[model samples]
Target: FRPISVFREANEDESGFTCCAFSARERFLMLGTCTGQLKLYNVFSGQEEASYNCHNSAITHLEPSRDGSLLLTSATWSQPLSALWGMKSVFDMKHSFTEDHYVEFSKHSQDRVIGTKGDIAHIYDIQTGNKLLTLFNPDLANNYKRNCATFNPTDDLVLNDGVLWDVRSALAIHKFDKFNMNISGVFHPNGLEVIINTEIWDLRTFHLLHTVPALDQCRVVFNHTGTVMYGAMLQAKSPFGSSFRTFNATDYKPIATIDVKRNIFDLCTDTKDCYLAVIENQGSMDALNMDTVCRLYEVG
Candidate 1:
């Protein structure tokens, strides 16, 4: 691997950064720290452009809207709020989320989000923070653990735990009984297929399509256009210690593999350029014994 830049002790503990993502608009590389700060970096220039406080606690999750008009963030602090940025910015809703419930933005639109805590899935309008619709799906067996939910590519349907529901009529559509694992619910761009963990499902028939044989036991990600795939092995000594695997999305054939001595806490690919390469965390506090590292490898 090629190292283009390194970020170290500017602040905090455990290498400071907890999660990271490449800017969707293709301008900066973003890092979320243990101290609720968001640091932006210039991909090639390696400049730490600016650091802004985004949360009162750790920024548990950070993702940019497809068009780069908004940023959706989550936290573990008393109120897990969402933050929007156009440089015009949005969100001061000041809401609360207990341990069991979770809030997630629409995977494709980001116009609306669903927060599930009880049997009801509270769908909220991101623009006005209004309750647009509510679905009481008791069929979600565990309900309390049903905290996993998201809108499909069109934002007309939701997949929670293992069930797909219609957002309009408030109907229970289908159940992915055989699907298992972390249940990422990654829908294909065309909306006809979904890759949840290890298996790909044909949404049209609601049947298993294919199961990939190899990937990081931690994360399996596809590039924005769905043309390529990347999976992280985190700290794997079993499968070629601390490695990453890539594949041709078209046929699921092996492309290349990367092995870094560092154990990964989080991994991300540039949503825009696909060139800013991987912005990964070495999980500080002796996570690397080397200090904070946000190494950049050029793809474009």
Candidate 2:
């Protein structure tokens, strides 16, 4: 498990990349650039397979369907609109959905989409862009905004603002009062646990499990087998610009830590959990090139 390869955009004039995602099978890598271009590359060969002008603004988010059949993209200026593209023809627009913002695909079901806007979270049928379920906050005085929403791995429930909602009945099953304004949340593979920010909580009883400190604005993800959890955080003013850590999913015990010297813009694990891909920006803010680099490390 060591560094294997590096990939970079050939066009020197291209703006910096904003987001990236791996195909469901880990056969391809997709990158969204600041100039609203989406590029797909062969993961192993590092060859550009296709490219498209997906949006008119900087791409804020990009995600692939669970089965790798479709690609979803959103931009900074067009936050309310998301374009869906077919995998076969990367440039051919398959569909587009609007109104709900910050959309994400379901982890278990490819046809489902979840998005948040204002004080409401919506579940939509991706095929037809029809609203299937709407989760709204009743306490209007507090004016809680639904910052993010995602489906459980089991596809049986949804989480927003630390509240678990039944997908079928559209009812609130449980709530974690302590998890306020969570930057992000993810369910454990077993579907009986979840992590909000650095805090892990038991989904069955809503009990505090464990906490990993100093992980603000970081992403938490599980390995392919869902047995190990990995996360990385940007360390300010430290010799090590960023740090990556692994924890045992069952007991929440720290396993390993790796310090990185470069400024990490994003990190993701391959579908098979064999590799971890990291985007490192080598150039400073004032540089003309911006010099974005992609590094792959064997994680298995």
Candidate 3:
């Protein structure tokens, strides 16, 4: 129901300013802080699993592959960007020179990665370590910069499916089949999701197949079968307050909302049943232990 310090204080030198990338199987937690350090923890015992110095710039994003075998971290410098670390099981992890703002492990392809930086999106081959494709955003990239990016579920046949955000405009734009100019609107939760718009897209599409409005800059995730969608929304302008919400794709109605007193920075939901991570305010973290609500909704 709440967050408790899972690791010993002595193990972490700093309180993380941010956190991301919950392991797919709920076995590990990855955190990113202002100091550009990345730490991994074993969720079962709350012990430090791994730690590495990743970037000269602040750590911006972290994610693990759908298979839970590989981990990705994005560090942003003034102009250039980089991706650090790899699958923990086979090879030692490391960083590489590549510009990326929002790093997403491909839902359809495990050996590939998707992200956006500047006006361009770079897709890379994780196995061969080569740049594959760079797709540019023509509509929002001119005056607005890309803030967040996510791949569409394989079944979203109607919309472009990929979700993207522009911070300057404070809008969550969707690339449904073509591109919806104003996908949806989101409000700022204190220092986040600042919106300046008349209307926002409800973010309804075949990709997600749901109609819930998203919090500004919040990510969207679906189950493996594309039946359930889960994520969190920040209370607009409310300092250090937020909540989690989930909906069924077939019904398109919000089933439950789990309220919280801290700012939720980022969250991740897996294809498995009732599994997700809530990144709390000032980078405090908590893994959800769902109860009857999740069971009734079948939010696995």
TM values, all candidates: 0.79, 0.86, 0.64
| C-alpha RMSD of candidate 2 | 3.4
Residue pairs clashing, model 1: 236-241
Model 1 deviation from native, Cα RMSD in Å: 4.3
> Ranking by TM-score, best first?
2, 1, 3
lDDT of 2 by residue, 44-73 (tens): 677778788888777767888777778888
**lDDT scores in order:** 0.62, 0.71, 0.49
The best candidate by TM-score is: 2
lDDT of 3 at 71: 71
Q: How badly does each model clash, as a count of residue pairs? A: 1, 0, 14
The better candidate by TM-score, 1 or 3, is: 1
Per-residue lDDT over 38-102 for candidate 3, one digit per residue giving the tens place of the 0 to 100 score: 77666546567767777666676777666666777766572346574655565355546466765
Deviation in Å, model 1, residue 295 alpha carbon: 2.1
Estimate the TM-score for candidate 3. 0.64
TM-score of 1: 0.79
Between prediction 1 and prediction 2, which has the larger lDDT? 2
Stretches of model 1 off by over 4 angstroms after superposition: 1-3, 9-14, 81-86, 89-104, 107-109, 116-121, 134-136, 142-147, 178-181, 215-217, 233-241, 276-291
